[PDB]
Design a protein around this ligand. Sequence first.
Ligand SMILES: CC(C)(COP(=O)(O)OP(=O)(O)OC[C@H]1O[C@@H](n2cnc3c(N)ncnc32)[C@H](O)[C@@H]1OP(=O)(O)O)[C@@H](O)C(=O)NCCC(=O)NCCNC(=O)Cc1cc(O)cc(O)c1
Lengths: 421, 146
Amino acid sequence: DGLWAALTEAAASVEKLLATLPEHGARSSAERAEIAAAHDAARALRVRFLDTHADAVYDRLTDHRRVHLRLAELVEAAATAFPGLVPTQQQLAVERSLPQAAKEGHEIDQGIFLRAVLRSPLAGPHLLDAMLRPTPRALELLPEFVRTGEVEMEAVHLERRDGVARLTMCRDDRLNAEDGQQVDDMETAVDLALLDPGVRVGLLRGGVMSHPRYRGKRVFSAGINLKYLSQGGISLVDFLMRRELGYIHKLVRGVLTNDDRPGWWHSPRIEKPWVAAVDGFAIGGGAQLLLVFDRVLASSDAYFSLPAAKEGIIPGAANLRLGRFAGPRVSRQVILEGRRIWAKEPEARLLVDEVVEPDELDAAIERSLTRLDGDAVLANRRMLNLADESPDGFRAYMAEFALMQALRLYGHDVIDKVGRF
Amino acid sequence: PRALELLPEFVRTGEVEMEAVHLERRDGVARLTMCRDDRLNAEDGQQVDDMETAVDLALLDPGVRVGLLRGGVMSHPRYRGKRVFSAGINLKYLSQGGISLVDFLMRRELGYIHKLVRGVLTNDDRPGWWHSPRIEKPWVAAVDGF
Ligand SMILES: CC(C)(COP(=O)(O)OP(=O)(O)OC[C@H]1O[C@@H](n2cnc3c(N)ncnc32)[C@H](O)[C@@H]1OP(=O)(O)O)[C@@H](O)C(=O)NCCC(=O)NCCNC(=O)Cc1cc(O)cc(O)c1
């Protein structure tokens, strides 16, 4: 062994250099290379330690796979139980108060950690189940939602109507640009939709925009908030990983419930079909969402892009899912070269089921919702999703993604590009 | 007659600013920009007169080889900073009685639009008129917005 002691020392060297060296941006090139080498030695040992000890580390935190912990709770418990393995809440607060260009990149350690956890065939599936459980916030709001049929959240408006959970993304000043709060609202709303027995089908649509160039027009998504990303407010764990393992995965697989109802022995998760309706455009994170719906409609003037081909972060699980929809040539055109796909071109039918003129779209959305009601759709979409995306495939991708995306979140090309927005 | 009047200054200057159209000779191209920035280039009697005048100038100017029709940058708030080709006839003026059967609807078809196809019929005043009594040139259209 000896890896823990080596890691502890290498982390100490890093903290000693951060204490003595000048602040980021005031460092000379020799000072910059010295701290960079210390970060590298420490992170190298984080990997080597977890290569052999990940399962034991995870077992301590979750009582040998007997307590389900979500991502935030997991990395926070790992910080206190294994100092130096991942950053503390206090170290993260310091990072979070800095712009991305000035951060030391302590989230990378969380990427290292979550990679090793998701790579384990024992710990990985367990963490994924934990993220499929209902959020506490949703369980809290569920009784009022059952009664009222309505919840107004900061980034999402949810309404039960005619057996449909109508999620409207309503950040009318910024084209529904995504942030940590949008993810929390989306997961809460998705949780409510799935837990509400009066909901049979879900609908995701963008609301009416108010920014002057789009006033009176609906817009689906302009993707991640690039301003916040530049400013330090995009969290690796609480945004980039949370959305993939939480609400987006619940759209596919449903919510894992307790053994508290009949039939749980054949359906431990409650899943329902989802419809997406795209107004204006779906960009980045919003386009990623479309790879997970049972039905996708778009207005005739809409387009779909994952535009950050030169200097962007990985487009979530698009790299996992797009090849299945579009094949390897088109997926590389979209992701490697930033090809934008328009709702009216033939290849839009790889991503969209129905393209409709603006004046006929509302009615076409309503028709689509009535077609997905039965028990037959539920069984069939479960079998399809199982065939389309294996547990191992999703897990193995999200394991590498945790580290690869962490690195991209701190890449100089990304920081530079995002600052110019 | 308006075009013949403006032709010498256009040959000299390479530029004419009209109410509904901006015309510029550049690199042998007659660049017609439809520039009613407040109403998405909605058409009226004056637009037709400007269009025909510009088309006439493009065809008569020996320094022009190819014509280009494009919409200019709009200033209306829903389209500010964006080019728009044409929103068609001015429906407000049509309601108000200001769309002329002869001077708009017939004039545009028999004048500038037909000159885009067939050119301008000139006098017998140049070599070759016996085989080409009309001067025609090729035209490019670039459609922004709609
Ligand atoms: C979409 C546009 C072409 C629209 O062009 P215009 O019609 O000229 O609109 P704008 O006036 O820019 O937009 C209106 C308004 O919203 C603001 N806006 C628009 N999009 C954004 C984003 N993405 N962030 C922040 N603010 C935004 C814009 O600044 C204006 O607000 P003011 O500054 O207050 O004037 C343009 O706004 C644009 O390029 N937006 C950014 C698109 C983009 O590159 N998004 C990021 C793509 N990358 C991801 O999503 C990455 C990602 C997301 C994920 O969810 C997960 C993951 O793993 C990775």
